[PDB]
């Protein structure tokens, strides 16, 4: 019973030539939450140029109606009051704080001491809770963090367990992990803090994202991040359509995603995003489906060919 977090609207928004209109975000958000039944959705980044603020507001206005405002999440930053104010205004109720997960990143971008930066973090989490939000924390560049500066990473997670947050995200930001490493890194933290909710968020640079995601599931993770058609910044995020199918058929864990809405979700973001998918795209490609040669992956299973 794993949670699936769709990042299509935000991380996917980062893709070159992709910019969703308010109507586009509302439509896509509604479909993912209601039809695909994705647990939560990360719709945007805070302090993006207003308008983006208006979009979130409209989506929040709607979400209120359907009794599911707690399912919407907003990428935020360590900037004191600015991020939390913007989200307070947006109407959104959940954060997803972007923190540096590698000693290398912390220094080349902030130039602060682990304790120095951990202070800025505690303040934003504090102020957010004070402002009525809930917080999820990204350990940006963690895939390089636990392999190069595992100390810095262990203290950050240590410090985070003291804060009142919902989940910790372990992203392979630069998509460099092999399934082995993904299992190592995740296992390293799940064993130390067996009562925390960690989620894996891989990137597909080596076409290992769904594989990595499977190892993360073995190492203990309780949730996973992904995007429709693997939309995203480089090679994109873990491809949602292939992740879910693989989880359902190649693992003993499950998901609440309704497979039958998978095909429409794909066509949906492809059109609105303006990024074409190849005809051989796993599970969702046009040419994908075409009883001696029976493959568990059938067209009607994903709302196609009938």
Question: How many angstroms separate the Cα of 61 from the Cα of each of 5, 27, 119, 233?
Answer: 21, 14, 34, 29
| Tokens at 205, concatenated | 């640079």
Nearer CB in complex with a second copy: 86/169: 169
Q: d(Cα 77, Cα 98) in Å, to the nearest integer?
A: 5
Question: Of 42, 73, 140, 241, which is the active-site residue?
Answer: 140
Q: d(Cα 138, Cα 78) in Å, to the nearest integer?
A: 11
x/- site string to a second copy, residues 104 to 133, per CB under 8 A? -x--xx------------------------
Among 8, 55, 149, 245, binds a second copy (CB under 8 A): 245
Q: How far out from the chain centre does Cα 68 lie?
A: 18
Nearer CB in complex with Zn ion: 40/304: 40
- Contact at 8 Å (CB) between 114 and 92? no
Among residues 21, 11, 4, the alpha carbon closest in space to that of 271 is found at: 21
Q: 155-178: b or e for each residue (b if 16 or more CB lie within 10 Å)? A: ebbebbeebebebbbbbbbebbbe
Residue corresponding to tokens 């104010």: 85
x/- site string to a second copy, residues 9 to 38, per CB under 8 A? ------xxx---------------------
CB of 195 to a second copy, least distance (A): 28
Of the candidate spans 53-61, 116-124, 160-168, 272-280, the one that interacts with a second copy by CB under 8 A turns out to be 272-280
202 makes contact with a second copy (CB under 8 A): no
Nearer CB in complex with Zn ion: 243/261: 243
Q: d(Cα 74, Cα 45) in Å, to the nearest integer?
A: 6
Nearer CB in complex with a second copy: 86/138: 138
Q: Is 116 a catalytic residue?
A: no
Q: Is 218 a catalytic residue?
A: no
Q: Residues annotated as binding site for Mn(2+)?
A: 11, 201, 203
x/- site string to Zn ion, residues 3 to 22, per CB under 5 A? --------x-----------
Residues labelled as active-site residues = 10, 140
């Amino acid at each position: 019973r794993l949670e699936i977090l769709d990042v299509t609207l935000r991380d996917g928004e980062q893709t070159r030539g992709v910019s969703f209109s308010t109507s586009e975000k509302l439509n896509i958000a509604k479909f993912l939450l209601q039809k695909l039944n994705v647990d939560r959705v990360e719709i945007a980044s805070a302090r993006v140029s207003k308008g983006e603020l208006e979009t979130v507001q409209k989506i929040m206005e709607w979400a209120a109606t359907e009794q599911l405002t707690e399912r919407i999440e907003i990428l935020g930053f360590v900037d004191g009051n600015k991020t939390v104010d913007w989200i307070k205004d947006s109407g959104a109720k959940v954060l997803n704080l972007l923190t540096k997960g590698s000693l290398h990143h912390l220094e080349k971008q902030l130039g602060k001491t682990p304790k120095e930066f951990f202070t800025d973090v505690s303040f934003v989490i504090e102020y957010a809770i004070k402002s009525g939000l809930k917080i999820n924390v990204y350990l940006e560049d963690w895939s390089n963090g636990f392999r190069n500066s595992p100390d810095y990473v262990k203290s950050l997670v240590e410090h985070l367990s003291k804060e009142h947050i919902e989940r910790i995200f372990l992203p392979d930001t630069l998509g460099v992990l092999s399934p082995e490493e993904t299992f190592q890194g995740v296992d390293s933290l799940i064993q130390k803090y067996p009562d925390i909710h960690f989620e894996f968020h891989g990137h597909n640079d080596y076409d290992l994202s769904v594989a990595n995601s499977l190892q993360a599931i073995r190492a203990g993770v309780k949730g996973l991040h992904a995007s429709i058609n693997g939309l995203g910044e480089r090679a994109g995020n873990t491809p949602l359509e292939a992740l879910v199918t693989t989880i359902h058929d190649k693992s003993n864990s499950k998901t609440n995603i309704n497979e039958i809405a998978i095909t429409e979700a794909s066509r949906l973001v492809e059109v609105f995003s303006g990024k074409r998918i190849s005809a051989n795209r796993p599970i969702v490609g046009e040419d994908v489906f075409t009883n001696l040669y029976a493959n568990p992956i059938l067209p009607e299973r994903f709302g196609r060919k009938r």
